[PDB]
Amino acid sequence: MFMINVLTLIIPILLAVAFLTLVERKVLGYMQFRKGPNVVGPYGLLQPIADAIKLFIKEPLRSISMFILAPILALTLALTMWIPLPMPYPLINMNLGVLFMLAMSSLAVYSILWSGWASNSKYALIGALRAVAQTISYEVTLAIILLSVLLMNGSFTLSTLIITQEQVWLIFPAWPLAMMWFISTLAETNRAPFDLTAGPFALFFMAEYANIIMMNIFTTTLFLGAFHNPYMPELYTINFTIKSLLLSITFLWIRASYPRFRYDQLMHLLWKNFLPLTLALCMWHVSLPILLSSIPPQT
Amino acid sequence: MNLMITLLTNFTLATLLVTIAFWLPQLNVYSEKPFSMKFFLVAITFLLFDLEIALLLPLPWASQTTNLNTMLTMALLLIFLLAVSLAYEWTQKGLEW
Amino acid sequence: LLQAEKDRRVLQMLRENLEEEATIMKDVPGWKVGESVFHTTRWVTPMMGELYGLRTGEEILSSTYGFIWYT
Amino acid sequence: PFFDVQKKLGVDLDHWMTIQSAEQPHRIPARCHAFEKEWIECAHGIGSIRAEKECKIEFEDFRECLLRQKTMKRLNAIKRQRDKLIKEGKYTPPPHHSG
Amino acid sequence: MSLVYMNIMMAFTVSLTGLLMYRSHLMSSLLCLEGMMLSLFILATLMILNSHFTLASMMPIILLVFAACEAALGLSLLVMVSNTYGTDYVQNLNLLQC
Amino acid sequence: PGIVELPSLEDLKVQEVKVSSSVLKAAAHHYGAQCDKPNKEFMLCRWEEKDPRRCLEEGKLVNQCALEFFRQIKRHCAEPFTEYWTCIDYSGLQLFRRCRKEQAQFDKCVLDKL
Amino acid sequence: MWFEVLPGIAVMGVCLFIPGMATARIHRFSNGGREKRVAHYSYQWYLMERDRRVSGVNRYYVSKGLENID
Amino acid sequence: MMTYIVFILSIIFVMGFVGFSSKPSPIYGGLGLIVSGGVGCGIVLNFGGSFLGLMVFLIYLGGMMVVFGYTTAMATEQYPSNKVVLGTFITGLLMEFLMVYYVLKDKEVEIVFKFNGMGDWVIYDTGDSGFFSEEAMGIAALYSYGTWLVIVTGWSLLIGVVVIMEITRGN
Amino acid sequence: MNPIILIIILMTVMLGTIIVMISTHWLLIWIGFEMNMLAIIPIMMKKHNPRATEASTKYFLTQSTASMLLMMAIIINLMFSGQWTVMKLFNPMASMLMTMALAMKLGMAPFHFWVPEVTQGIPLSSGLILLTWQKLAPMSVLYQILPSINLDLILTLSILSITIGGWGGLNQTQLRKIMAYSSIAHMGWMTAVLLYNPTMTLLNLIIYIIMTSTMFTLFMANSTTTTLSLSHTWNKAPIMTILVLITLLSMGGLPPLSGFMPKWMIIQEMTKNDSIILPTLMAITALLNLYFYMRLTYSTALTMFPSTNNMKMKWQFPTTKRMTLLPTMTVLSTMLLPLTPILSILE
Amino acid sequence: NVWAKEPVLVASFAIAGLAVILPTLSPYTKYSLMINRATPYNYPVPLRDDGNMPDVPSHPQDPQGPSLEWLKRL
């Protein structure tokens, strides 16, 4: 039954990412004055399916072992990185899972650098080196902010987190920390306004958008949600899914609106605006439970 | 070993996706035809802040002990030293463009 | 209560193991039958090979490595 | 040299990382705790060479508690005798799944 | 002697010989030094976890963060070597002859 | 070298308290309350002499006190004790804050009848 | 209007709803209806091993309630 | 798929160390060392291992190989094999197969030691009532006990930062 | 750089060697060695030539592999009898690796290949501080761990260090390589006694440190790196000649002068055992390593080399240098013959 | 002043200064110490009776020893 659990996880990742692409394209269309796409079939579903098919039948051409090894790592992260996400009963009860999130984000940085090395000595690989540098400049911020938002939760176990979110949401004790972390999720997804940047393009594209859905599900679990009532977990599943959907639409909706940074403005902004503010909010979150006598039950 | 089974299934299915991406089209039709310094400062900067993150991050497991004063003292000392390193490169105009 | 159960169970494993060792080494030179290799005759805690020997796979996997990768 | 600001200020800043059998934070033991306690109580006011001469038994006992060497030797010998007598065929073993 | 320790120390020795003999570059030598670092980390970690050596469990994490900043220093030095030349060969280092 | 002392199954046969996890966990406060006055004799035996193969008598004694405890709770109230531990049973790792109504019912049971 | 973007949202939300429902039903379906005993600590694993030992079925969830009192 | 799963992962660990200590091109060496770090993480998590092994995996794989491949890609080229590299791989593979031969076909292997090569479930605890970990309160020291050590550690890292900027053109 | 930054970095070199001195633990000793490395790198490459770049590269590789081999020896020590105390070890193999790691750390003749090459292409302050503190740091550890060492290692490294530090230099004219070969020879003398009475080893360490400070201070009296510059120091000032004369002859080890006192007392507490072949071999090679001293003396102190004008131009200007503490260390390091019973000051 | 120059820096140093100083004013750090000390993990050991103590209550129900009552009273 355990391989059946694995198949019920990683068969809807294909449908999830493909229908995510139609959802984001339709949503951008209605953000503008566009009905795109609706002509190709009933409300545009066979258009992403058959378009994925056409992308698989492109017949491209060509170091070969490196070109093999990069997108296989990207998509095996995209598969193996929905394991401890506690849609009510998670797949593996990891004692620590958030540090596993950080480690596999670093593996995504490996993937980008291997693709840039496989790109065979190009001004594109210099740009991809810069993209590796900007992507690696974010796991400091994400780990430190994640450390502070678990500090009010005691353990790394994330079931304790779903215990903590019953009374009020955790968005209220840490809202600006959450704001900086959500900007870091925009940062880690390598999309707008944080840009730029051959095949197999379907597998690489799949890796990026499964990484997006992972970051949005983890955002939804980390800060808000509903209550885990046993012997009817589907209620929590539905409410969690609705909130994660609204957050992902908001995520693409913020992508729909602003021009993208300058690279040096991005570094300048990152260090000289997030990084002291992270440290200051984090030391305040350290000294907070000793001044409220509320340290969480680290069991 | 359950997670090893998951890793094995995901790795094998992803390799089958890559081989569907490559060795599928049977229609074999027609075969045809300097670096900078400021890139390097960012990596070592990340590296040293990551090391001090590794020093910081076992903080919440430690939160259940008696010596609270020394804990709060050395914790504030660690974040203060990290911010002092940041302010040192900030005031010595290091990471600038 | 669980502690007393554990003590009865480990003494049961040691008794079974020494009886089966007395059988299994019945015609070998040397081999005193009850060798505490430690000179100080005290209670020493066994090392899961003294407990979970001669089992062939199943229960030693569920016992030695059961918690370590359960789920 | 061996300077002793360590003793002149009298601060145990280093005397907790040092051995086993000190005050672990939640008061849990190591694997060979009593062996270290007996070997150190054998070797306290002892001049580091008669420590070799006259704390031999408990030091060997502590070493074979730490590594557990001769016990694994005896275990390997018993398993190889098991292999040769199951090659012989005498008593297809009722150690497993019986008493 | 817990036979995983055998081939861990063997692979340590092979990593050390990789640090010693090298014919073209220096980054590969520093990378084999990092592998030797990993070997020390793994051996100490398996021992402290075996012995229930719960009090001084600082050793593997502190060992790796320190030898990590050692490797960072080595990277800065190799960048300075490669910046005062075009490459980072073992050759073109024979100046200051003896 | 020195021979070992393993007392055989002559003294190593007492009928176990063969109940499961959740019932034993949910019965814990009353188990430590009324009985487990002489098991601290057993624990003091165990910590004053760290050599099990010594404290077998008081291990037998705490086993039979547990058996008598469950007999006493079986003959009297409650049968909804079974309802209480099957209420607390299926809740994963057992949060005691899940099942509260039948905790109150079992409280009134044990206080009135015994 | 955006009445038409709602079927794509609904179908992709069905695709998000399915793995948690399948996982929860498989846990409640292949463990005798009892929830799968989450275990993080060696205490709880020892308790679970003696639980699956005393049941005799070699399944920890059978739970053998209040019968071996005699 | 047997008892010796820790031993097999140790064999693949030695394979990875020989794979980059056979002196390849340094980005292939970084690939092999990523493989080595992953399987060493597997070994330490087999000993459990829950905290520290996957912990420093972030620092080792999550912080070092990225910077090594970064500097390796940007500095020099080796842009498009030799018998010495594959010969070192031959000798490492042969000594590995010789160790497998003498472990599995004999009693013990002694270089200058006494290795009892058998089922390494030994040594292990008899399921005590730990209820946290060893690693939990282990690394949850350094704060109620670690006065001196983390002070000199952070001080050394701050000096490391100022050393790096000086070498790479302080100020 | 900044002077405050140099205050901090030299403070950390002090702190690292003190942590090596002070702890009963092994981890703090390894951290002290590493911090010593990390802080002694930027003292080198104080100028901006690729000479110091390659020197810092060689120093970092040898220094790093020595530290890693030391950590290997400590983890082997805890594979055997397990504690982090700085005392007698419990393995011939771990002590073997530990003495080899400390031999790469300070410099013995199998491992001396990096020392002249790193001491040539560096400024003089960097060379002085690396020689004094990098020979001061491991001798504390050796003093502490001495009762577990097989004598074949220390004896072989000592004999070979004295003879290779003698035989090198006779072709060499660069003064930094001369002084580095002298460092190898005196470290061999400092090593060959440690299994007999270590008080002599730490006394020879004090004497050699004071002599090296006087030597490099009189090489910092003006900017000189070769012998012909020392001939110009002859014709520009007379007192520097006789001071270089007396410090060179005290490095030679002659009885009415202070540098003989570490040699002879070592011979004494050697030969209260039945070691005779070892003192006569060590002392014949101590006769051998005086020849390059003596040809430097013959070059620029007692013969009179022809000089070059613009020394006429240099005659108008005062020696406005700074000396850290020159005359105190000089006359304390030369006239210290009748204070041989200040041996027992070291307990 | 500097409130327009680098305002996030000013807010950072402000919350940092209060995070440093603010533990000097608390009626709650003693509550933190009592909570984090009085949580039992290991086994509460027994001991020999005949020290003749007017303490160490022989019954866990017996409140003769030092205990907690401010817990349930918040």
Residue numbers in the entry:
A (entry chain D1): 1 to 62, 67 to 201, 217 to 318
B (entry chain D3): 1 to 33, 50 to 113
C (entry chain AM): 73 to 143
D (entry chain S5): 1 to 99
E (entry chain 4L): 1 to 98
F (entry chain A8): 1 to 114
G (entry chain A1): 1 to 70
H (entry chain D6): 1 to 80, 85 to 175
Sentences from the paper on this structure:
The ETC is composed of four large membrane protein complexes: (1) a H+-pumping NADH-coenzyme Q (CoQ; ubiquinone) oxidoreductase (complex [C]I), (2) a succinate-CoQ oxidoreductase (CII), (3) an obligatorily dimeric H+-pumping CoQH2 (reduced CoQ; ubiquinol)-cytochrome c (cyt c) oxidoreductase (CIII2; cytochrome bc1 complex), and (4) a H+-pumping cyt c oxidase (CIV) responsible for O2 reduction. CI is an ∼1 MDa membrane protein complex with 45 protein subunits arranged into two “arms”: a peripheral arm that extends into the mitochondrial matrix and a membrane arm that is embedded in the IMM (Hirst, 2013, Sazanov, 2015). In mammalian heart mitochondria, the majority of CI is found in association with CIII2 and CIV (SC I+III2+IV; respirasome) or in association with CIII2 alone (SC I+III2). Here, we report the isolation of functional SC I+III2 from ovine heart mitochondria.
CI appeared more stable within the SC than previous preparations of isolated ovine CI (Fiedorczuk et al., 2016), allowing us to improve the model in some peripheral areas that were previously disordered. In contrast to the isolated ovine CI (Fiedorczuk et al., 2016), subunit NDUFA11 (B14.7), the traverse helix from ND5 subunit, and a few other peripheral areas of the complex were well ordered within the SC, confirming the stabilizing role of CIII2 on CI. The structures here allowed us to improve the completeness and accuracy of the ovine CI model and to obtain an atomic model of ovine CIII2, with clear density for endogenous CoQ bound to three of the four possible sites. When comparing the particles between the classes of the original 3D classifications of the SC, isolated CI and focus-revert-classify, it is clear that the closed state particles are distinct from all other classes.
